[PDB]
Amino acid sequence: NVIKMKSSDFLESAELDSGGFGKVSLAFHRTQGLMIMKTHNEALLEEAKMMNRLRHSRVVKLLGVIIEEGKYSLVMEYMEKGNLMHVLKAEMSTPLSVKGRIILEIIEGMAYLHGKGVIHKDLKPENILVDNDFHIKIADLGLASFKMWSKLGTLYYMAPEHLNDVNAKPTEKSDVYSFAVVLWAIFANKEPYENAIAEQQLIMAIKSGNRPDVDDITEYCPREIISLMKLCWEANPEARPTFPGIEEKFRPFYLSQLE
Numbered sequence: 001n002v003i004k005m006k007s008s009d010f011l012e013s014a015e016l017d018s019g020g021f022g023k024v025s026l027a028f029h030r031t032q033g034l035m036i037m038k039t040h041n042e043a044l045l046e047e048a049k050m051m052n053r054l055r056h057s058r059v060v061k062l063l064g065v066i067i068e069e070g071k072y073s074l075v076m077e078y079m080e081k082g083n084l085m086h087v088l089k090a091e092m093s094t095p096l097s098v099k100g101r102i103i104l105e106i107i108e109g110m111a112y113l114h115g116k117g118v119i120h121k122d123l124k125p126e127n128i129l130v131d132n133d134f135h136i137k138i139a140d141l142g143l144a145s146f147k148m149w150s151k152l153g154t155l156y157y158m159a160p161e162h163l164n165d166v167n168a169k170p171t172e173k174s175d176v177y178s179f180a181v182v183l184w185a186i187f188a189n190k191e192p193y194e195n196a197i198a199e200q201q202l203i204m205a206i207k208s209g210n211r212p213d214v215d216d217i218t219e220y221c222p223r224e225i226i227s228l229m230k231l232c233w234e235a236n237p238e239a240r241p242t243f244p245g246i247e248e249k250f251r252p253f254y255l256s257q258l259e
């Protein structure tokens with residue numbers, strides 16, 4: 001069961017920039033502290049109850065909902081340092097062992113989501129949020145995984161089977177492709193395809209088998225992680241592993257080489 005909330009429980013607002021997902025709001029619960037707010041009543045609630053069951057340390061929790069006349073808001077836990085891309089482009093830059101942990105925690109969170117039959121469909125640095133200790137949580141701030149709540153750069157992480165084909169149904173392996181490009185971004189410390197001509201041209205190129213430039217990596221990236229990204233951004237969805245497949249290989253690798 002969901003905490004159904006009221007806006008009289010919130011002191012109020014400090015609308016923050018949410019990384020390309022439009023406006024959100026950092027609002028102060030009068031009893032339970034800081035929270036974030038994204039602003040058919042039984043269909044909504046039914047869904048809100050579905051998503052509120054999503055409970056894992058690497059997944060942003062839906063705390064509850066503000067369904068009042070005019071305003072429909074979802075209420076979620078706050079992550080102080082923002083999205084993964086922002087923290088990477090930060091001046092005091094982040095070491096290799098911490099990047100390894102972020103990767104493993106992204107794997108854990110995604111495995112959980114799948115295990116509860118949720119397909120994210122829109123994984124990307126913007127939906128990977130960070131707290132003060134540099135642990136991460138997966139979010140869905142564009143409501144990609146929703147149906148009724150949805151009704152009420154983007155493309156760089158999308159699997160080629162979805163580029164120019166919006167009728168094909170996302171699979172677990174759609175999320176694996178997005179992971180591959182996140183891996184890339186984690187070591188390049190920027191967005192891929194800097195030199196792109198047009199979206200139309202770039203899309204064709206990606207559907208035909210172009211990927212981010214593994215040479216833009218001015219850091220040391222271990223060669224077993226460059227292998228994993230190439231595995232995970234295979235054109236053919238069937239040739240990509242599952243997140244449990246990735247974890248089983250990457251966790252022993254992490255602890256034994258990255259600690």
Ligand SMILES: CC(=O)N1CC[C@H](CN(C)S(=O)(=O)c2ccc(-c3ccc4cccnc4c3)cc2)C1
Pocket residue numbers: 016017018024036060076077078079080081082083086129139141
């Ligand atoms: C334009 C600019 O100069 N900047 C925006 C990004 C850069 C990062 N900052 C240090 S921050 O502004 O303090 C910050 C912003 C947004 C968030 C956030 C957003 C959306 C969230 C959804 C769910 C959970 N937590 C969230 C948390 C958390 C922290 C500062």
Ligand SMILES: CN1C(=O)N[C@H](Cc2c[nH]c3c(Cl)cccc23)C1=O
Pocket residue numbers: 051052054059060061062074076113118119120138139140141143145
């Ligand atoms: C918008 N929103 C989140 O970011 N986290 C919560 C819970 C949630 C719903 N769908 C999710 C996906 Cl696909 C991943 C992580 C959290 C979630 C929520 O409602």
